Amino acid sequence: PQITLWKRPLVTIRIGGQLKEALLDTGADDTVLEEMNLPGKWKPKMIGGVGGFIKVRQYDQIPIEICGHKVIGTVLVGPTPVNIIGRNLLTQIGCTLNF
Amino acid sequence: PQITLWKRPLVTIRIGGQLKEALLDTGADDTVLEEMNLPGKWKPKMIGGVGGFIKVRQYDQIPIEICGHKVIGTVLVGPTPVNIIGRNLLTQIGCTLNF
Ligand SMILES: CC(C)CN(C[C@@H](O)[C@H](Cc1ccccc1)NC(=O)O[C@H]1CCOC1)S(=O)(=O)c1ccc(N)cc1
Numbered sequence: 637p638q639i640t641l642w643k644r645p646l647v648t649i650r651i652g653g654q655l656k657e658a659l660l661d662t663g664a665d666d667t668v669l670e671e672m673n674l675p676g677k678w679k680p681k682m683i684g685g686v687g688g689f690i691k692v693r694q695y696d697q698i699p700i701e702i703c704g705h706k707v708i709g710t711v712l713v714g715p716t717p718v719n720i721i722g723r724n725l726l727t728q729i730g731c732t733l734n735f
Numbered sequence: 736p737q738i739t740l741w742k743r744p745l746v747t748i749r750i751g752g753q754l755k756e757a758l759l760d761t762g763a764d765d766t767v768l769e770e771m772n773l774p775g776k777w778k779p780k781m782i783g784g785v786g787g788f789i790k791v792r793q794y795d796q797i798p799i800e801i802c803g804h805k806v807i808g809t810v811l812v813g814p815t816p817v818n819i820i821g822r823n824l825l826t827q828i829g830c831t832l833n834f
């Protein structure tokens with residue numbers, strides 16, 4: 637697809653068997669999702685942005701389906717106010733910025 | 736250009752007579768720059784990000800040049816950890832996400 641930026645670049649994803657809406661975010665180094673349960677091992681990490689930092693759980697090698705593109709990689713989970721697909725998974729779908 | 740996302744999509748912008756490095760940020764509604772002594776009328780506002788809210792100065796109708804593309808719009812100035820080009824100006828340079 638080609639996604640224009642007049643509106644937020646929201647897409648449907650599936651993770652852990654569940655469908656969610658998420659922002660395609662080129663400003664995010666790594667994918668971070670709103671508080672949820674995910675199976676498997678995780679480790680604590682900090683991420684920072686506008687407003688400061690939050691503590692998250694880092695899960696590695698997690699399958700995610702993004703608009704029918706299957707990726708597998710790092711998913712952070714914590715108190716972000718929005719679900720965010722970051723560069724780590726955008727590269728896996730072959731996403732580029734064009735102008 | 737067609738910009739891959741292996742690394743942060745940093746570009747050079749020209750604003751208020753200064754050359755600055757900024758992040759092309761599809762997850763950002765607004766453009767927010769690190770604190771700087773920009774002349775002009777502004778209004779105080781708050782914006783929210785991952786970690787909470789910050790107070791910013793809102794400057795309207797500011798000329799900005801992004802990768803040779805000359806645009807005009809709202810620029811927020813405040814304690815962001817990185818200069819961010821958000822959708823208000825990404826639409827003006829004709830930027831799209833493609834995968
Ligand atoms: C600030 C950049 C450098 C990093 N953020 C990504 C940005 O797109 C961020 C995404 C977001 C949108 C809406 C609500 C909350 C967050 N938008 C953002 O703050 O919009 C503000 C600034 C202007 O307009 C409004 S991040 O969320 O902090 C972040 C940091 C690290 C990781 N691994 C993942 C996410």
Ligand SMILES: CC(C)CN(C[C@@H](O)[C@H](Cc1ccccc1)NC(=O)O[C@H]1CCOC1)S(=O)(=O)c1ccc(N)cc1
Pocket residue numbers: 770771779780790791792812813814
């Ligand atoms: C608002 C914060 C940054 C604290 N201010 C410091 C001020 O220099 C502040 C710095 C600033 C510059 C540019 C963007 C944002 C903030 N200038 C300012 O123009 O900010 C307006 C814009 C949006 O909201 C308030 S403070 O309240 O004045 C103050 C002063 C002394 C003490 N001890 C405590 C607080």
